[PDB]
Amino acid sequence: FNKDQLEEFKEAFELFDRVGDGKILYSQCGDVMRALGQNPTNAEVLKVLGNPKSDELKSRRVDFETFLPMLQAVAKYEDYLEGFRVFDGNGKVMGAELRHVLTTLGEKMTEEEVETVLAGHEDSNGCINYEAFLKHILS
Amino acid sequence: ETTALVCDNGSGLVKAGFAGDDAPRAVFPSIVGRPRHQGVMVGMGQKDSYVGDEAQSKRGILTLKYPIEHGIITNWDDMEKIWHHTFYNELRVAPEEHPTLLTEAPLNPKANREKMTQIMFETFNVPAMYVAIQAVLSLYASGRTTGIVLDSGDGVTHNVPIYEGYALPHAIMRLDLAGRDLTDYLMKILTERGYSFVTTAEREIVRDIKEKLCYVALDFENEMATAASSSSLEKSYELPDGQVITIGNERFRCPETLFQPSFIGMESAGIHETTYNSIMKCDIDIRKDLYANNVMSGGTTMYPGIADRMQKEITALAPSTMKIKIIAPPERKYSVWIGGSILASLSTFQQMWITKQEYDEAGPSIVHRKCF
C-alpha cells in the first residue's frame, strides 16, 4: 500500500471510530475490511484477529496501525456463478430457499439483512436473475 | 433308519429280532434234522432236511443234530442253513439290507469268530457286523455297570467280572457244565427207575422233563433223606404216547450237579466256587461291589431255587461282614438278547461296526483287531 492508500484506509477507519480515540474493536476489524472492499468470512476475520475471545472482541480496542497488517493479510467470478447455479436450471433461484440457506447454513446472516439486499430483485413469481443480482452485488 | 438285527446264536436256541424291540421275533431250536428212513410214497414232496420248528414237529422220523456244542460251531454247512432260515424264512428280511450283531461265549477258539465273519460278509453279504461277549450284554439288560455275571446256557457256563465297564480278563472263568450235560445225566439216571431214552428224538423229551419237573434243593442231604424215606416228593409226567412216568428224589439230583460236577466226573468246582474264585481273582477295592451285584443269566439258571441256593452257598464262603445279593430277574433267559437289543440301538455304537469296506481290505482277521 502507498501513502494515498494508507491515508484513504485510515480515513475510512476513522469514520468507523465511534468513540473518538482513533480505535476500533476486534469485532469491527472485519467490518472495516468489508468497508474497504474486502469480503472476508467471519472465520477469516477471527483468524486474522487471532481468534479473540468474546470479551476482548466486544471491548478490546485497536487503532488503525494494528488493523493494517490484518487488512494486508485479508487482501492476500466463474466459481461465484457456479455457486449460485447450485441453487438453481432455468437461471432463477427461489427467494425462500436463498433465505433459508443464508439464515441457516454457513456463517448465518439475519433475515433482515437478506430482506434488505433482496428487496426489489425478485419478480412476481418470486425468481431472481442471479447473474444480474450478482453483478449488482459485486460492483 | 435301517435298524440292525440282533441274533443270539447261543446254543440250542436261536433268538433273533430287530434292535430296539423288547423281545425277539424268532425263538426256535438251533437244530437240523435229516430223514433216516426210506421214503415210500411217491409225489409226497420230500424235502432234504428240516431246520428248527419243523425238525421239532417231525422229530420221530428224523435224526437231530445240534451244529453248536459248547459254544463252538462244529458244522458250518449245518450252521449256515440255520442262519439262512433265520434271515429269510423266520424274520423274512434280506440281511444284505442292514447290519447284524452276533454273540459268543468268551475264551472260545479264535477261528470261530473268523468263520462267522467270513460267512456274514461272503454269503449273506451283510453291510456290517459285530460279535459281542454274551456276559457283557447281560449287564446292559439288567441295567448295571458293575456286576459279576454267571451266564449259563446250553453248551457253556462262564463268569465275567465287570467293574464300571472295565472287564477284568484275567478273572474270566469258563466251565462246560450246561443244559446239555444235565440232560445227558438225567438220561443216565432215569434208567434207575427203568425208563430208557436212547435216541435224539427222545433226548428232546428228556430235555422237556428237565424243564418242567426239576428244581434245586436248598440243602441236598436232607431232601435226599426225605424223599428216600417219604414218597411225598414224587411227581408224574405224560410221555407223548400217553404213558405216565414218575420221578421222585431224582428230579432234584440232575440240576444239583451244577453244584457238584463230581457227579458226572468233572474235576472242577461247581458254579458257586467258580463264582467265588472269580471274585477272589479281582483286586480288593472292588470285591464289595462284585459281592452285591451277582447277576444270573441264561436259561440253565431257571431252575426254581437256584437263586436261594447260590445266596446260601456263597454266603457260606464270603466274609460275614460282606453282603451277598443274587439278582435273578424273571426274563433272564432272554437277557442276552435284550442286552444286545439296547447295545445295537445306541448311537455311540454306530462307529463300532466292522464295515464291509474294512473287511475287504484287512481280511477276516479284522475281528480280533476291531472287536473285543
Added chain:
Amino acid sequence: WXAXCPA
C-alpha cells in the same frame, strides 16, 4: 474243540 474235549 481240537484236543481236550469232543468239540
Added chain:
Amino acid sequence: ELYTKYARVWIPDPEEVWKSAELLKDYKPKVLQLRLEEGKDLEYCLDPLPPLRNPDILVGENDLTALSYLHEPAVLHNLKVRFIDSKLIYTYCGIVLVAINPYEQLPIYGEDIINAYSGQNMGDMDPHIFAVAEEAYKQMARDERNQSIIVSGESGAGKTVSAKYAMRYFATVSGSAANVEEKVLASNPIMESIGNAKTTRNDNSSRFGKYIEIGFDKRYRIIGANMRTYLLEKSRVVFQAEEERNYHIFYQLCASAALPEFKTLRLGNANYFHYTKQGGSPVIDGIDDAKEMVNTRQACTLLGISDSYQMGIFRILAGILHLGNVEFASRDSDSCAIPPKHDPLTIFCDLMGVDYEEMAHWLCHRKLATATETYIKPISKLHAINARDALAKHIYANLFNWIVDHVNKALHSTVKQHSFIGVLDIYGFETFEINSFEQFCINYANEKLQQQFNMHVFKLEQEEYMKEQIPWTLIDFYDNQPCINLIEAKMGVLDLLDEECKMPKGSDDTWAQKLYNTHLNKCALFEKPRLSNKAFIIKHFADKVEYQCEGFLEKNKDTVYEEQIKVLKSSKKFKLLPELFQDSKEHKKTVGHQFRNSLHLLMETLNATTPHYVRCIKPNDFKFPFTFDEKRAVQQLRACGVLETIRISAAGFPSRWTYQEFFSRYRVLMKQKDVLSDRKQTCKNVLEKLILDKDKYQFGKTKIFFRAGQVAYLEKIRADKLRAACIRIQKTIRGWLMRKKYMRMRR
C-alpha cells in the same frame, strides 16, 4: 475414514444403550474429543472406532434397509423416533414387518384404511399389517401357490392382535359375510387356558405353535379356518423350575374347587398337588383364576362343546392332578409297592372308573411278552415315578389334541377348500438367567425357522438381481446349517441325550461328559463354561446361550407302559376317556424325539408355501402407552433376529436408488458441462468419479446398487460442497452490505 469435525457418532452408555455425540475435532490415526449433549467435552478412547451416524435425511425413513450405516444404534434410533414422535407402530426391514406394540388402541385399523390398501402394490404405501395381508392375498390369486404369514415374538408383544387384524382384512377384501372371525377369536380362551403358561419372565407365555389355516374357495369367498398345533411343551405338565407354573388350566381348576359341580373332583388348593406346588408360585398377581375359568367355559360353549364333555375334561384334569400325588414305597432297591388303601390312588380310580387293584398292579410292574411267553417284571421306585409321570404327560397331550379337534369341528365348513392362507403364531428365541431343556427345544425350533427365512430372503434376492442383470456371485449366502447339525444330526446334542436315556445308570453328569468328549474341541460352535463341568454353550444364531445339564434326562424321558393305557381304555364310566386313546414305537419315543418330529411336520407345512414374516416387539416392561425403553427394545430386537438379519443385509448391497431420483438428488455435485442427455451414462460418469473404487456400486438396468456406507459418503460430500458455496455467497453479500454502510458513513 472421514471422521471429521461435526461428524456425529454414537457412543455406548450404560443407561440408554447408546448416546449421541458429536466429533469435536478431526480424527487422525488414540483418543477423540467428543462434544456430548450433557457437556461440551468428554473424551473417548480407542482400543486394541465408534459407530458413525446416518445423515438426517435418512433417519425416519419407512424402511430400515434405506439406512446407509446398518447397526444396532441406528436401528434403535429409527424405531424410537418413528414410534415416539410420529406414532407409526409399523416399520419394514427387508421383507420383514416389525410391529412395535403400543399398548394402546388406535384408529389405524378402520375399514377406510382397509379399502386404501386393497389392490396396492407393497412399496406403494407406508407399512401396515394390511400391506402384508394384501401381499399374501394377491399372491395367492396371482399364483397357485398357497401362502403363510409367520408371526414371531414374545407373547406380550401382541401376536394375537396382528392375527386378529390379518383375518379382519381377509374377511373384508373377500367381501365375505361367514362368521369365522368371531369364532376364531372366541377360540382363544380355551387354547390359552390349556396351552399357555406363566414363565419366570412372562405371564401367558404361549408354549406351542398355533397355525390357523384360513381356507378360500375357488372364487376367494372365505371358508372357515382349520386349526393345527405343533411343538407343545409336554414336560411342563410334570415339572416346573422356581416360580414357574404349569398350564393355567390346572390353577383355574383348583381355584374352582368350591363350585358345586366340582365337589366330586375332591380338589385341594393349588399347593396340595405335586404337579402344581413345585414352582412355589400359585398366584399371579392381577389375575383371578377363579374368573378366567368362567371365560374358558363360555368359550367352550360358544364352540359348542357340550356341558357333558366340559365336565369330562375337568374330570380328566382332576385325574391328572390326583395321579401325581400317588406316592410309591420302595420294597427293595429293585422293587416297589403302593402302600395299602393309598388315598390319592383311591380318588383317582374313583374318578377314572377303573378297578383299584389293576391300577395298583400295573403302576408297579411291567409286562414283557414274546410271542410264546410273557413275564410280569417288577420295577424300581425310580422307574415307577418315571412311568407315572409319562402317563400323566400322555393323558394331557391327548386331551389337548382332542380339544383342538372339537375346535376344528366347530370351525370347518363343508365347501371344498380351494386354497388357504396360514397364519402361524410362534414364540421367539428365548434366553434366561437359568437355562434348561425347555429353552433348548425352543432355540432349536428358532434355528430351523431362521434357516427357512434365510433361504427365502436369499432366493428373492437372486430374483431381484436377475431382474436388474447383476451377477449372482456378489450375493454371499450366510448359512447356519453347521449349528443345526450340531443339534439334530447324528452324535448331536439331542442324539447323545436320547442315547443317554437308555444306557445303564446314565446321569446328567455322564451325559455332560459325553458332550465334551464328542464336541469340545471338534466343533466351532460348542464351548465349555470355564468354571463348570455341568453346563455347555451353543453359539446360536442370535447369541451365545449357556444351558445347564442338571435335569435334562428326567425331562427327556417318556415311556408309557402300554398296559397302563390298556387299563384306562377299559374304563366304562364316561365317554371321553376311551375317546382320547383312539388311533408301538410312538410310546417308546422320548420327549426330544417327539419334538424333533413335530418340528419336521411344521417345516414341511411351511415349506409347501410362500412365507411372509412379521416380528412383534414389546417396548416396555410396564405397559406404559407409547414409551420405548432402549434397554428392553434392544433385547427384543436381538431375540427376533432383526439385528442378525440386518448384519447379514449390510454385507450385501443394501441401498438401491433409481437413476432418475439419484440424478435429481446429486446434480448439485454435477457440473453443467457434464450432464448429458443420457441419464444412465451421466450418472455412470459422475459416480465413477465420485467413488473411485468400482467395488462400492453396481449399475443395474434400472437402479444403482451401493454398498453400505457409500450413500452417507455422498450425502456428506454434498453437504460440504453446499456449505462451502453458501459461505462464499453469504460472505460476499455481507461485505457488499457493509461496504454500502461505509458509503453511508462517508455520506
